[PDB]
UniProtKB/Swiss-Prot annotation:
<keyword id="KW-0436">Ligase</keyword>
<dbReference type="GO" id="GO:0008756">
    <property type="term" value="F:o-succinylbenzoate-CoA ligase activity"/>
</dbReference>
<protein>
    <recommendedName>
        <fullName>2-succinylbenzoate--CoA ligase</fullName>
        <ecNumber>6.2.1.26</ecNumber>
    </recommendedName>
</protein>
<keyword id="KW-0067">ATP-binding</keyword>
<dbReference type="InterPro" id="IPR045851">
    <property type="entry name" value="AMP-bd_C_sf"/>
</dbReference>
<keyword id="KW-0474">Menaquinone biosynthesis</keyword>
<comment type="similarity">
    <text>Belongs to the ATP-dependent AMP-binding enzyme family. MenE subfamily.</text>
</comment>
<dbReference type="GO" id="GO:0009234">
    <property type="term" value="P:menaquinone biosynthetic process"/>
</dbReference>
<dbReference type="InterPro" id="IPR025110">
    <property type="entry name" value="AMP-bd_C"/>
</dbReference>
<dbReference type="InterPro" id="IPR042099">
    <property type="entry name" value="ANL_N_sf"/>
</dbReference>
<comment type="function">
    <text>Converts 2-succinylbenzoate (OSB) to 2-succinylbenzoyl-CoA (OSB-CoA).</text>
</comment>
<dbReference type="Pfam" id="PF13193">
    <property type="entry name" value="AMP-binding_C"/>
</dbReference>
<dbReference type="InterPro" id="IPR050237">
    <property type="entry name" value="ATP-dep_AMP-bd_enzyme"/>
</dbReference>
<comment type="pathway">
    <text>Quinol/quinone metabolism; 1,4-dihydroxy-2-naphthoate biosynthesis; 1,4-dihydroxy-2-naphthoate from chorismate: step 5/7.</text>
</comment>
<dbReference type="InterPro" id="IPR000873">
    <property type="entry name" value="AMP-dep_synth/lig_dom"/>
</dbReference>
<dbReference type="Pfam" id="PF00501">
    <property type="entry name" value="AMP-binding"/>
</dbReference>
<comment type="pathway">
    <text>Quinol/quinone metabolism; menaquinone biosynthesis.</text>
</comment>
Length: 445
């Protein structure tokens, strides 16, 4: 099997790959410059490296070069603290970091950008089962989880998007969203798979982006609702050449939906996560008019169900499909991530009679208690091993001395002694992680 970039250089090398306004690369240009750089990258003999990068042409060259070199890329969120980077990079065993913006980080080898087939010039082969990219989840919601994404995951995400959202060879996608996050990087992947053009832009400027939309034949754009609104306020009151506006990540109001539809804007809402390599639920303009709160329907070969619903039908959202990750790399004690192959998103959702998914709350993966991070998943692992406990969930509970404390809810056929459970928990957890409140329940809250 041939590399996607190689294929594009062969099959349509005179098609434009990337534009930043000033320069523009064709696929032939991109392939050549990436291939040349890849030889320089292989000479470090690391199979997994850090990328400290911005939304720029040079950063896209570097990304494409790494993949031609059979290197796995770990994306660094440039908004992180030096300690968080260090911790994340050490956790997945990288020591070499490639830069397109200045970085200083002690304990890492940091290299900024000074220095036919890739079978013939690189001695590298393409495999769909290779890990393309490694992304970390947010530390504000729970633990920082290393999510390995394979070329197969990324490819399955693309063709489901091709069906749900829709793009072709004539697509000019404006990408402003961070390149280190999945909404950013998935655009590049869709592009190199389909063979369309990316309009890369360094940072959100509503005025400059509207000028681009008016004057550059932009067909596709990825946004959050707040930025869509800011664009509408600069003067986006008609689609111009826009075919698709992909929204995701935050709440979309009915008011904003109605305003955008009035201006004839082709707005699509979506739901997705790092673990699914971008969106797995998509809502069309028409779906959004009917159900303002929906994130939509899934795509042809993605399978979505609710685990233990209410009579309202609310329950944790479970997903199966080729786009879903093979499992986390770090931390290495997350044990409850799959159930019969279904990925537990940890989102409370429902599917109504028509197939529309509505997301509600989230399962909280973090209890901050007395200036300490504690993780429910760790308590639930240990508790489920105690004799007679079939199921358990650890939630936050109010405590005036500490703010929040962990409380354990458990399902048990027998009659659990709290004292025996506390003692068992204490043998396998550090003392602060051990809950101080317990409740036997027939069904978990």
């Amino acid at each position: 099997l041939d590399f996607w970039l190689y294929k594009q250089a062969q099959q349509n090398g005179h098609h434009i790959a990337i534009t930043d306004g000033q320069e523009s690369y064709t696929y032939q240009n991109l392939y050549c410059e990436a291939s040349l750089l890849a030889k320089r990258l292989k000479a470090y003999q690391q199979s997994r490296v850090g990328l400290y990068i911005d939304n720029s042409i040079q950063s896209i060259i570097l990304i494409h070069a790494c993949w031609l070199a059979n290197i796995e890329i770990a994306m660094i969120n440039t908004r992180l603290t030096p300690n968080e980077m260090t911790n994340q990079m050490r956790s997945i065993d990288v020591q070499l970091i490639f830069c397109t913006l200045p970085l200083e980080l002690r304990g890492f080898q940091i290299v900024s950008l000074d220095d036919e087939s890739p079978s013939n010039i690189l001695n590298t082969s393409f495999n769909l089962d290779d890990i393309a990219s490694i992304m970390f989840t947010s530390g504000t919601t729970g633990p920082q989880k290393a999510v390995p994404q394979t070329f197969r995951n990324h490819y399955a995400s693309a063709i489901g998007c091709k069906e749900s959202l829709g793009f072709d060879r004539d697509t000019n996608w404006l990408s402003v969203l961070p390149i280190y996050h999945i909404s950013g990087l998935s655009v590049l992947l869709r592009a190199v798979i389909e063979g369309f053009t990316v309009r890369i832009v360094d940072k959100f400027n509503a005025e400059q982006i509207l000028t681009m939309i008016k004057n550059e034949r932009i067909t596709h754009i990825s946004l959050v609702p707040q930025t869509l609104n800011w664009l509408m306020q600069q003067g986006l009151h008609e689609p111009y050449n826009l075919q698709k506006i992909l929204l995701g990540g935050a709440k979309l109001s009915a008011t904003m939906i109605e305003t955008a539809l009035q201006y004839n804007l082709p707005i699509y809402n979506s739901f997705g996560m790092t673990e699914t390599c971008s969106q797995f639920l998509t809502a069309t303009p028409e779906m959004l008019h009917a159900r303002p709160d929906t994130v939509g329907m899934p795509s042809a070969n993605v399978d979505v169900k609710i685990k233990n619903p209410n009579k309202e039908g609310h329950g944790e959202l479970m997903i199966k499909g080729a786009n879903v990750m093979n499992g986390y790399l770090y931390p290495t004690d997350l044990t409850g991530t799959f159930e019969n192959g279904y990925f537990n998103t940890g989102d409370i959702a429902e599917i109504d009679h028509e197939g529309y998914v509505m997301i509600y709350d989230r399962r909280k993966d973090l209890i901050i208690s007395g200036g300490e991070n504690i993780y429910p998943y760790q308590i639930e692992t240990v508790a489920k091993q105690f004799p007679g406990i079939s199921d358990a969930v650890c939630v936050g509970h109010p405590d005036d001395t500490w703010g929040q404390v962990p409380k354990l809810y458990f399902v048990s056929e027998s009659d659990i002694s709290k004292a025996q459970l506390i003692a068992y928990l204490s043998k396998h957890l550090a003392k602060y992680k051990v809950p101080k409140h317990f409740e036997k329940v027939d069904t978990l809250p």
